Design a protein around this ligand. Structure first.
Ligand SMILES: *[C@@H]1O[C@H](CO)[C@@H](O[C@@H]2O[C@H](CO)[C@@H](O[C@@H]3O[C@H](CO[C@@H]4O[C@H](CO)[C@@H](O)[C@H](O)[C@@H]4O)[C@@H](O[C@H]4O[C@H](CO)[C@@H](O)[C@H](O)[C@@H]4O)[C@H](O)[C@@H]3O)[C@H](O)[C@H]2NC(C)=O)[C@H](O)[C@H]1NC(C)=O
Ligand SMILES: *[C@@H]1O[C@H](CO)[C@@H](O[C@@H]2O[C@H](CO)[C@@H](O)[C@H](O)[C@H]2NC(C)=O)[C@H](O)[C@H]1NC(C)=O
Ligand SMILES: CCC(=O)NS(=O)(=O)c1ccc(-c2c(-c3ccccc3)noc2C)cc1
Ligand SMILES: [Fe+3]
Ligand SMILES: [Zn+2]
Ligand SMILES: [Zn+2]
Length: 341
């Protein structure tokens, strides 16, 4: 079989894919979709082979029979003796971020405030925060909790999209892909950084990667970590240096998924691909690097050291975990066991 078709979401991920396709020598070809849900459909249809997904979407794909193949793994302090591919995933931290100057704003005073979400149906951006709020609220009206928000994937005409900007020409407002100015980790964080929303639901690495001259992007140039705070669940506020003791949850790393009858073939190709384009790959710094897309997190997160093997050949429920799976199920009874398509 040996040739893999990768599904790219949006035009920016497509242009990076073609570059990968080129350097691969047609080993990897691209398919494009305007949304992640459409990419899943393409993989079900068999028109695309695989794609890297956020846990939230892995639940969706899971109910449709797709399976996790390899997970993203970042550089850690613990487990240095083991190589990156055989090394277990540690998972990222879901947090709630705010401006320091915005005093008196805690977890208990979020109602009727403005929010910034990575996108609808995602772990740190939607599922974790909204699940918690639904519980504490005892109501399914999460569309009324915040006054205005930017949550890519929601109804454009609703308040949940009100804070989203769209692209260069203000078109595609609220679309769930990088054309939306406030889409994803970097998008949601910029949303807070520019003071559009009062809070942003991203992950811990995002704050660090886009502050203290790490990003070099016009909007991130002058951001200082000291100007930001994390909202803990006990109603306290802490510096971004205390994420381990002030997070909403710990999430399962983004993973590459595919149809179970293609997983073996997809896995084989990818390992060979990162041997060439990975962190220390033969052709990375020189020709092309798979895990670099100038802080835009295209196809993969920029902090990915390598895609790691799973081990225990886990199902999508085992990969996500029982904890998280019951959270999504509970949150979903608001908006019954079948593939959404
Ligand atoms: C939003 O609200 C919902 C609704 O409350 C929350 O969903 C609930 O989440 C709970 C916590 O995850 C969950 O509670 C249960 O906890 C028990 C006890 O956990 C045990 O801990 C042991 C440590 O000593 C450990 O060794 C055990 O393995 C075990 O995990 C769990 O065990 C039950 O099941 C057994 C089945 O054999 C049973 O015999 C036993 O008596 C226990 O009842 C259980 O699996 C579960 O984790 C609860 O299930 C959830 N509620 C629902 C609707 O199912 C969400 O978390 C909230 N959202 C957010 C974001 O927080
Ligand atoms: C496209 O895929 C083929 C098949 O894996 C690659 O050819 C192999 O490449 C490895 C290492 O790059 C060599 O050691 C093998 O001898 C090659 N032969 C095989 C098994 O076909 C090829 O390199 C890939 N092209 C790109 C640019 O990714
Ligand atoms: C990506 C999220 C993740 O990997 N979570 S995990 O590491 O905590 C995890 C992985 C595998 C299992 C698992 C279990 C299990 C059984 C009883 C009690 C707890 C876990 N059984 O089979 C498998 C696979 C559970 C959690
Ligand atoms: Fe995520
Ligand atoms: Zn914790
Ligand atoms: Zn198992």
């Amino acid at each position: 079989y040996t040739r893999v078709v990768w599904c790219a979401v949006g035009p920016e991920e497509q242009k990076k894919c073609q570059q990968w396709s080129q350097q691969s020598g047609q080993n990897v070809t691209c398919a494009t979709a305007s949304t992640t849900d459409d990419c899943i459909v393409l993989v079900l249809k068999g028109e695309a082979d695989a794609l890297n997904l956020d846990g939230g979407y892995i639940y969706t794909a899971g109910k449709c029979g797709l399976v996790p193949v390899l997970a993203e793994n970042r550089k850690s302090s613990k487990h240095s003796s083991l190589d990156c591919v055989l090394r277990p995933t540690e998972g990222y931290l879901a947090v709630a971020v705010v401006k320091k100057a915005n005093e008196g704003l805690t977890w208990n005073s979020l109602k009727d405030k403005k929010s910034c979400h990575t996108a609808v149906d995602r772990t740190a951006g939607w599922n974790i925060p909204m699940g918690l709020i639904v519980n504490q609220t005892g109501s399914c009206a999460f569309d009324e909790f915040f006054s205005q928000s930017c949550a890519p994937g929601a109804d454009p005409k609703s308040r949940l999209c009100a804070l989203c900007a769209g692209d260069d020409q203000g078109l595609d407002k609220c679309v769930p892909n990088s054309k939306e100015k406030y889409y994803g980790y970097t998008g949601a964080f910029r949303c807070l950084a520019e003071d559009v929303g009062d809070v942003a639901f991203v992950k811990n690495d995002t704050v660090w990667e886009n502050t203290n001259g790490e990003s070099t992007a016009d909007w991130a140039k002058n951001l200082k970590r000291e100007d930001f705070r994390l909202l803990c669940l006990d109603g306290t506020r802490k510096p971004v240096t205390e994420a381990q003791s002030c997070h909403l949850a710990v999430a399962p790393n983004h993973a590459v998924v595919s149809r179970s009858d293609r997983a073996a073939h997809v896995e084989q190709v990818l390992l060979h691909q990162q041997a060439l384009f990975g962190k220390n790959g033969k052709n990375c710094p020189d020709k092309f690097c798979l895990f670099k897309s100038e802080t835009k997190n295209l196809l993969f997160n920029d902090n990915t050291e390598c895609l790691a093997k799973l081990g225990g050949r886990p199902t999508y429920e085992e990969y996500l975990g029982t904890e998280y799976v019951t959270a999504i199920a509970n949150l979903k009874k608001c908006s019954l066991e079948a593939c959404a398509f």
